Each structure stands twice: as C-alpha cells, then as structure tokens.
Amino acid sequence: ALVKEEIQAKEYLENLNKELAKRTNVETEAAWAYGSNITDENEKKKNEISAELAKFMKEVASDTTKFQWRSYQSEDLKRQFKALTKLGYAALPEDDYAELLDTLSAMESNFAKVKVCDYKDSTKCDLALDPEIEEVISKSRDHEELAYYWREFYDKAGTAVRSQFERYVELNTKAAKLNNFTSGAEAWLDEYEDDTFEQQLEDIFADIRPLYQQIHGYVRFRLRKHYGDAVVSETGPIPMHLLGNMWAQQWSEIADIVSPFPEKPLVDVSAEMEKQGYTPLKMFQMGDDFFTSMNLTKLPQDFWDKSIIEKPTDGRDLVCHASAWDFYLTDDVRIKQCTRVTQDQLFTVHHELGHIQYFLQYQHQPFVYRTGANPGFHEAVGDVLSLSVSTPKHLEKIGLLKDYVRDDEARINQLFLTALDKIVFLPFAFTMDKYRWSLFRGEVDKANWNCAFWKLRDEYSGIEPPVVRSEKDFDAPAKYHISADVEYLRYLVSFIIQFQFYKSACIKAGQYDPDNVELPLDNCDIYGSAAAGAAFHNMLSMGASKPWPDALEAFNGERIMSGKAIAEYFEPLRVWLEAENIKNNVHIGWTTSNKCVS
Ligand SMILES: *[C@@H]1O[C@H](CO)[C@@H](O[C@@H]2O[C@H](CO)[C@@H](O[C@@H]3O[C@H](CO[C@H]4O[C@H](CO)[C@@H](O)[C@H](O)[C@@H]4O)[C@@H](O)[C@H](O[C@H]4O[C@H](CO[C@@H]5O[C@H](CO)[C@@H](O)[C@H](O)[C@@H]5O)[C@@H](O)[C@H](O)[C@@H]4O)[C@@H]3O)[C@H](O)[C@H]2NC(C)=O)[C@H](O)[C@H]1NC(C)=O
Ligand SMILES: CCC[C@H](N[C@@H](C)C(=O)N1[C@H](C(=O)O)C[C@@H]2CCCC[C@@H]21)C(=O)O
Ligand SMILES: *[C@@H]1O[C@H](CO)[C@@H](O)[C@H](O)[C@H]1NC(C)=O
Ligand SMILES: *[C@@H]1O[C@H](CO)[C@@H](O)[C@H](O)[C@H]1NC(C)=O
Ligand SMILES: [Zn+2]
C-alpha cells in the first residue's frame, strides 16, 4: 500500500542523494584535474569516471519505476523522484556515451589549445586567446590587424572541429529522444519548467529590441567617424572585429571612441587598479568582502587552498575560460580563473563568486536540489553585485575612481557604457541558442550550417564577419560555450532577471527611489546591505527545491520574469539616445550581410 511505500521512498531518496553527491564528487575531481591540466591521461580519467557515473544513473532511473512516485502525497518527494528520472546523456548506450564524451573533449581541448602567429612576427606562434589574442582585439584600432586575428582564431577554434561538432549534434539528438524530448532544444528548455518559456523571451526581447537598434545605429555612426566609410558603411551590418570583442558580445572596450560625451569622464578603472598594485588575490578578497558585507557567507579555507586564480607559468595546456566548481561535500568550492588586473575582470571575479555563494547557500539541500532555481538564476547572482561595483558610487568608495563629477553628461556616458555590455549582449545570447536549437531540431540542412549561424548574427545583432565566409568555414565553435556544450539561454535569462534582483535589492537597501533624484537606480550600491543580503539568503538557500517562480517570490514577492526592470534602468538613456540619433540624422537598421556565400 501507498502510505507505507511513501515512507520507504523518503528513506530511499535520503540515502540515494548522499550517494549521488559522493559519486559526483569523484567525477568532478577528475574534471577539475583535466581542466587545470590538459593531458591525454587526464582526459582518459575524466571520461572513464563519467562513463561509470552514467552507468549508475541508468540503474537509478530504472529503480524509480519500482516506486509509485506519481501517486505520492508529498510534492517534495515527487519533485525529487522526477529529477532522478532525467538521465540526459546518460540515457545513451554505453558505447554511444563513450563516443560523445570523446567528441566533447576533442572539441573543448581544441579550443583550449588554439595558438596563432604574431601579426608582425610569423616566427612567434604561441599567442593564445587568453590573454594574447583578446588583448589585441580589445586594444588595437588597426582594422587590418584586427581582421587578421579574427580570421586566424575562427579558422582554428571554429572550422577545425566541424566533423566533431556534427557527430555531437547527432548524439545530442539521440540522447534527447531516448529521454523522449523531441530534440536537445527541448531537453535544455526543460530546465526552465515552463511550456511558454520561449514565447516569454520573444516577447521580452521584442520590447527591448528597439533600444538595441538605437545603440547599434549610434555606435556605427561613431565608428564611421573613427575608421572612415571605406571600413564602416552607414547602411550595412557593423564589421564585428571593430567592436572590441572576439564574438562582438560586449562592446565596452570601444567606449573611448563611441562615448556620448568624450570631454566628460568615462569610467575605466584598470589603470588605477595597476597603480594601486592590485593582484588577483586582492580582487578575490574584495569580492569575498562584498558578499560578507551583505551578511552573506564567507569563502571557506578550501576555496583559498585549492582555487587557481592566476594562469600557470609552466608550459602546460589548460582551460583558461573562467569557471566556478561545486564538489558536493561541505565547503569544497573552487574557482579556476586566469585572472588579469582589469575593470571587466573585477566584474568577472564577482560573477564567478556569485556561483560560489549559491553553492554555499544550498549545500545543506539534498543533492538533486543542489543547483540553481533555473540556470539563469545561477548566472544572475554575481552580476547583481557587479552592477553596484560598477557604479561611480562604489568605485569612489574603494578609491578606484578619482576626481569624478557626476553631471548629466557623465551619467549618460555611464549608462551608455553599461548598455554596451547589458543591452548589446541580449541579441547575441539569444542567437547562440537559436542557432543550436535549429540544428538540434533538424531545421537546417548540413549544407547550410555555417551561413545559418551568420544569418542569425546578422538578423538579431546587425554584425558580420570582417571577411567573406562560406560553407567551407564553420565558425560557431569559435565561441567557448559552443565547443564546450554549455547551454547559453541561461545568460539571456540572467541579463533580464538580474535587473529584477538589482532593482529589488536597491529598494530594500534604501538605495533606489524612482521619485528621488538623489537615488537613481544606475548609481545604487548594495555594499554593506544586510537587507539586500537577506533577500539573497531567502532565495539562494532554496536551490532547486521549488519551481523558479517560488524562488523569485522568496526574493521580492514576484513570480513573473519581466523586462520592466531592465527597461526602467535604461530609460534615461533611451530618452537621450532617441533624441541624439534624430539630432544627428543617424541611420537605423541594416541591409542583409554579403559576408557568407551560400
Ligand atoms: C519513452 O516513451 C516510450 C514509449 O514510446 C517508453 O517505452 C515504453 O515504456 C513502458 C514502460 O513504462 C513499456 O511498457 C511495458 O510494456 C511491456 C510489453 O511491451 C512489449 O510489447 C510492446 C508492443 O506491444 C513492445 O514495443 C515492447 O518492446 C515489448 O515487447 C509490458 O509487459 C509491461 O507491463 C508490465 O508493467 C506494468 C507496470 O505498470 C504499472 O504497474 C503498477 C504495478 O506496480 C500498477 O499499479 C500501475 O497501474 C501500472 O499498471 C504492469 O501493469 C504489467 O502488469 C506488467 O508488469 C509494460 O506495459 C513499453 O513497452 C515501452 N515501449 C513502448 C513502445 O510502448 C519509455 O519508457 C519512455 N522513456 C522514458 C525515459 O520515459
Ligand atoms: C563553463 C562556463 C562558465 C562561465 N564562464 C564565464 C566566464 C562566461 O562564460 N561568461 C559569459 C561569456 O563569457 O560568454 C558571459 C557571462 C557574463 C559575465 C562575465 C562572464 C560570463 C560562467 O561562469 O558562467
Ligand atoms: C599534468 O598531468 C601530468 C600527467 O597527465 C602530471 O604528471 C603532471 O604532474 C601535471 N602537471 C601539473 C603542473 O600539475
Ligand atoms: C545575518 O544573517 C543571519 C542568518 O544568516 C540573521 O539571523 C541575522 O539577523 C543577519 N544579521 C543582520 C544584522 O541582519
Ligand atoms: Zn556564470
């Protein structure tokens, strides 16, 4: 009978969760060792442990059918059982799973091992993306030099893994169907527990899209004045190599040439960080200080002992792309970041520490609940702090911003600088998964895979490659997350909901009042606010124990994902920019790109 069985089921889950945490610890350790030190030996070890865990998960999923779990009274027990039925890749036959793991490490290691030759020195060929190539992309205003590094990187990080990517799509699809999802798109979207999630994002994106078009138009106008009309046309997509980022996902590196008021201050604290002798250690300690100032959890000793916060100086290959790691015990959490002393890196440190805080907040939960309310929640945490860290208010407090006068023009500069990151990112992030969804769903023929990528980049972001590409190239895997099989929609969700969290935290902190000119949202600093921290504790401690609207409700009483807050933040910019584009007769929109030959 069911009453007795539900009691047995509760005991079953309690033991299984603890077992899963312990088994996952071992897989995570091997994954950490490989990421910190890429070798054929470590790859083999990582993949063999994963195969072992997958086999165990199959048995778990099989064992769930022995319990009448759908018949139970407890919503909590039913939720835990449902989590256990979701095998993902582990649903694949033994041999297929092994092949997928081999395909995945082939792609990630290719990306991590990319090296190009110096533009000026063809004998020096040890330039890696992080930091050598990214430094040129962020700093050079030599458009031909930029185009050279763009092509070299995309050819090596992208085109080189086409065959592996193709097999990955096939096996990803096979896995999704074994879990009875239509494709990997539906498998990813399942994490958001909402059958209208795509439509919701289309609706929010459509509301913010006109502001992006205005920013795009103004930036193109300003780039024409810098590079001339031979490099940048008035009516075409912007050549992406001029935007200060390898993937044109963030344009903040070219703020010095596109800022609304060039004679007024533009916040760039990298030089002052170097002048004050900042180190990666100091940056992480400052991050820790921010969290604890909000009455949140201090970084444990394991973090400091085990984390890698600087790029190793030996000859070894590693994944430098920053990440945060949960080892599923108590207080064993780590970051691996090839940290540099820059303003954007200070934000990246806080982003990564946001993941760590989430790990610590929910580590008391049963294993299946030791993850974000949804993937976007996990990405949002650290960005909420970075928003306040980025304010002139905060940067003055820590002595990184000196002799700053916050007049109307300086405010517009700062709002624009923020938008070059936050608004610009939105169409980018959407296209990363729109692309992969379309491949997963079988909506694009293999003969059209490359130009399908560039078509989306054109349609949504109005950017294009610096040189003509074709189906002989394969450019998508040149973005880390595409080579590394990391879902990207989490970041689109994050960039929307982080403003919901930020607005609410600022109101709680007494730092934002819409009717008070002295408390604007764009200058809110939540440092030292226990009240804002209390909201975070209430939400983060839940992990995935409840559907995400319940986690949002615990933060601020709301249950709906909304673009209201991000629009509210940027409203003063929207008003000024619409007027400025009209003042300057700025062309808005773009013709279809000629840069991908079918
Ligand atoms: C993805 O979707 C798949 C369907 O498209 C699904 O695959 C199905 O899973 C079913 C298991 O839930 C499975 O059903 C069993 O079928 C057995 C016979 O199947 C044969 O013939 C089929 C064609 O006629 C072939 O396709 C098969 O290959 C087989 O040759 C039955 O013998 C079996 O039965 C037993 O189990 C049920 C248990 O059900 C419950 O039992 C409790 C008792 O505790 C009851 O209280 C409760 O009410 C309920 O009845 C018993 O009722 C029964 O007495 C037997 O013990 C069972 O029906 C099905 O075969 C399979 N394939 C297909 C094509 O249907 C995947 O599972 C889905 N994947 C995921 C991850 O969800
Ligand atoms: C395995 C990928 C980890 C990922 N790594 C970071 C560096 C990352 O990829 N990104 C995303 C990116 O770099 O594409 C944007 C996101 C916005 C804040 C700064 C860095 C964040 C993460 O921590 O979410
Ligand atoms: C990297 O891994 C190799 C074996 O794969 C090991 O011998 C070596 O100690 C590791 N290097 C470092 C710097 O940890
Ligand atoms: C700090 O957090 C604890 C719970 O973690 C809470 O009880 C306490 O009230 C908080 N401190 C302040 C000053 O609010
Ligand atoms: Zn993240």
Q: Is the CB of 40 under 6 A from ligand 3?
A: no
Ligand nearest to the CA of 317: 3
- Determine whether 481 is an active site residue: yes
Nearest CA owner, ligand 4 atom 13: 530
Nearest CA owner, ligand 3 atom 12: 37
Bridge partners for 239 per DSSP? 464
Of the candidates 380, 386, 300, which has an alpha carbon nearest to the alpha carbon of residue 349? 386
CA dihedral 358, 360, 363, 368 (to 10 degrees): 20
| Cα(378) to centroid(ligand 5), Å | 7
Question: What residue numbers bound the domain in which 59 lies?
Answer: 1-598
Distance set, CA 24 to CA 53, 105, 109, 541 (Å) = 7, 18, 22, 21
Nearest CA owner, ligand 2 atom 4: 323
From the candidates 321, 350, 481, 537, give the one annotated as an active-site residue: 481
Q: Where are the alpha helices (H) located in 294-424, listed in sequence order?
A: 301-306, 343-361, 375-389, 392-397, 408-422
| Cα(87) to centroid(ligand 1), Å | 18
Per-residue 3-state assignment (H helix, E strand, C coil) for 66-91: CCCHHHCCCHHHHHHHHHHHCCHHHH
Q: Where are the alpha helices (H) located in 307-342, listed in sequence order?
A: none
Question: At 571, which helix (H) or strand (E)?
Answer: helix 564-583
Number of Cβ within 10 Å of residue 54's Cβ equals 21
Number of Cβ within 10 Å of residue 91's Cβ equals 20
Q: 3-class SS at 325?
A: strand
CA distance 480 to 362: 28
CA dihedral 262, 264, 270, 276 (to 10 degrees): 150
- For residues 88 and 179, the answer to whether their CB atoms sit within 8 Å is yes
CA atoms 69, 71, 72, 76: torsion sign: positive
- For residues 251 and 240, the answer to whether their CB atoms sit within 8 Å is no
- For residues 373 and 539, the answer to whether their CB atoms sit within 8 Å is yes
Structure tokens at 44: 């083999």
To which residue do tokens 């615990």 refer? Answer: 554
Distance set, CA 346 to CA 282, 357, 382, 422, 514 (Å) = 10, 16, 11, 16, 29
Q: At residue 324, what are phi and psi to the nearest 5 degrees?
A: -115, 145
Q: Which residues neighbour 116 within 8 Å (Cβ) at sequence distance 6 or greater?
A: 125, 127, 133, 149, 152, 153, 156
To which residue do tokens 């294993």 refer? Answer: 367
CA distance 384 to 353: 11
Question: What size, in residues, is the chain?
Answer: 598
Q: Is the CB of 322 under 6 A from ligand 2?
A: yes
CA atoms 29, 33, 38, 42: torsion sign: negative
* DSSP string computed for 411-427: HHHHHHHHHHHHTTHHH
Of the candidates 527, 572, 573, 536, which has an alpha carbon nearest to the alpha carbon of residue 393? 527
Tell me how many domains the chain contains: 1
| Cα(295) to centroid(ligand 4), Å | 6
Query: Euclidean distance between the first and final Cα of the chain, in Å?
Result: 64
Q: 3-class SS at 557?
A: coil
Q: Are strands 469-470 and 333-336 parallel, antiparallel or unpaired?
A: unpaired
Bridge partners for 333 per DSSP? 326
Q: Is the CB of 42 under 6 A from ligand 3?
A: yes
Q: At residue 124, what are phi and psi to the nearest 5 degrees?
A: -95, 100
Structure tokens at 222: 């300003």
CA distance 450 to 76: 45
CA distance 576 to 408: 10
Q: Is the CB of 84 under 6 A from ligand 1?
A: no
CA distance 592 to 235: 10
Of the candidates 481, 480, 487, 482, which has an alpha carbon nearest to the alpha carbon of residue 112? 480
Bridge partners for 597 per DSSP? 470
Ligand nearest to the CA of 481: 2
Structure resolution in Å?
A: 1.9
- For residues 354 and 540, the answer to whether their CB atoms sit within 8 Å is no
Q: Give helix then strand counts, H and E, for the chain.
A: 24, 6
Q: Is the CB of 336 under 6 A from ligand 2?
A: no
CA distance 474 to 310: 32
- Which DSSP letter does residue 516 get? -
- Determine whether 134 is an active site residue: no
CA distance 567 to 575: 11
CA distance 370 to 22: 13
- Which DSSP letter does residue 182 get? S
Cα maximum dimension of the chain: 79
Q: Which atom belonging to ligand 3 lies closest to the Cα atom of 37?
A: 1
- Which DSSP letter does residue 308 get? B
CA distance 196 to 174: 24
CA atoms 231, 233, 237, 243: torsion sign: positive
- Which DSSP letter does residue 520 get? -
- Which DSSP letter does residue 393 get? H
Q: Which residues neighbour 57 within 8 Å (Cβ) at sequence distance 6 or greater?
A: 87, 90
- For residues 217 and 424, the answer to whether their CB atoms sit within 8 Å is no
93 HSE (CA, 13 A, CB side): 3
Distance set, CA 323 to CA 10, 162, 249 (Å) = 34, 25, 18
Q: 3-class SS at 116?
A: strand
Q: Is the CB of 530 under 6 A from ligand 4?
A: yes
| Cα(538) to centroid(ligand 4), Å | 11
Residues by chain with Cβ below 5 Å of ion ligand 5:
379
List the determination method. X-ray
Q: At residue 461, what are phi and psi to the nearest 5 degrees?
A: -100, -20
Number of Cβ within 10 Å of residue 320's Cβ equals 21
Distance set, CA 137 to CA 50, 133, 154, 239 (Å) = 37, 6, 13, 13
CA distance 83 to 61: 10
Q: How far is CA 556 from the centre of its chain?
A: 23
Ligand nearest to the CA of 90: 1
- For residues 469 and 450, the answer to whether their CB atoms sit within 8 Å is yes
CA atoms 462, 466, 472, 477: torsion sign: negative
CA distance 109 to 499: 35
